[PDB]
């Protein structure tokens with residue numbers, strides 16, 4: 001045993017307090033509560049997303065922890081807010097979303113063989129009967145927007161419940177916290193459900209963790225879940241210094257905690273009394289996303305788009321980007337520039353990706369608004385160099 005409590009390291013564990021997102025949780029929780037306390041109970045739809053390609057940055061955690069503190073602060077006011085969490089990777093339709101929600105309520109709502117609409121009505125009625133409020137988390141919400149097994153009208157009936165399913169006493173008792181992978185979710189939403197999107201109370205973008213933030217996160221897991229003589233700060237700094245986004249990493253707290261976990265269980269198999277720097281570096285060592293799968297040609301092409309975007313141009317034409325890609329491809333990346341239809345297939349792939357936007361009337365292209373060019377280019381150049389040398 002290096003562990004004093006192994007649960008602290010499970011993927012699902014939230015700590016009893018936040019030390020990095022900690023302010024921006026008690027606060028939000030303050031938002032959610034003020035609407036409750038001012039009357040007009042629970043109805044807002046809020047949203048959390050990150051940058052594109054970023055994972056393990058505290059989205060889920062911030063949401064779960066925010067809902068929990070809303071519950072607690074509400075309880076002190078004698079109110080009663082219930083929590084539901086639903087992951088879209090587990091919920092292919094409206095039926096299955098509602099069924100997960102009601103099972104977490106504990107209410108006696110008939111769910112077997114029942115219409116979705118009927119479940120939602122029973123839920124609205126139980127919340128009135130109980131005088132309870134429900135705050136629902138919809139995680140991986142982007143993959144609900146694209147799912148063809150969920151229609152616009154389903155998202156509407158859920159997310160504007162109160163417009164379609166009035167309360168016995170007029171009090172709205174369901175709010176939602178959407179968690180999406182990135183800002184592309186908002187376009188989709190304006191496409192599919194603009195009547196909800198134009199009405200979102202708070203949209204919060206979360207940045208990837210810096211090294212000092214990863215330190216603070218690891219330290220707290222160490223304090224809570226490892227024996228006190230087992231780690232020193234130096235051991236934690238070896239992970240945070242590599243994964244901190246200010247030092248060229250991901251900013252992933254999941255990669256950071258997993259690494260620390262792994263090193264602890266390597267020490268244990270050795271019967272060792274503590275961590276050693278070696279074990280941590282070993283873990284860090286055996287431990288960009290939808291950019292990481294692209295072809296050098298797509299990377300090379302997308303890079304040049306960001307440079308136009310970086311130096312004046314809003315919208316490049318096809319012919320121009322074409323010769324530029326040709327010029328750079330053979331002369332600068334020693335790869336042989338592909339043919340015309342193949343180039344335009346790359347260009348279709350990056351637009352289907354929301355990494356590039358098109359403008360029809362060959363087609364006009366600019367870097368997707370949400371990507372910073374100078375720093376994407378910096379990223380696109382590490383991934384571009386992992387492919388040059390193979």
Ligand SMILES: Nc1ncnc2c1ncn2[C@@H]1O[C@H](COP(=O)(O)OP(=O)(O)O)[C@@H](O)[C@H]1O
Pocket residue numbers: 010011012013014015018019020021050054055056057058059060061062217252253254257
């Ligand atoms: N602010 C934080 N404080 C403590 N732990 C965190 C924090 N943010 C993230 N974590 C941890 O890092 C891992 C990844 O977090 P998660 O919320 O799943 O990121 P995302 O949803 O953006 O992929 C989880 O173990 C989570 O507990």
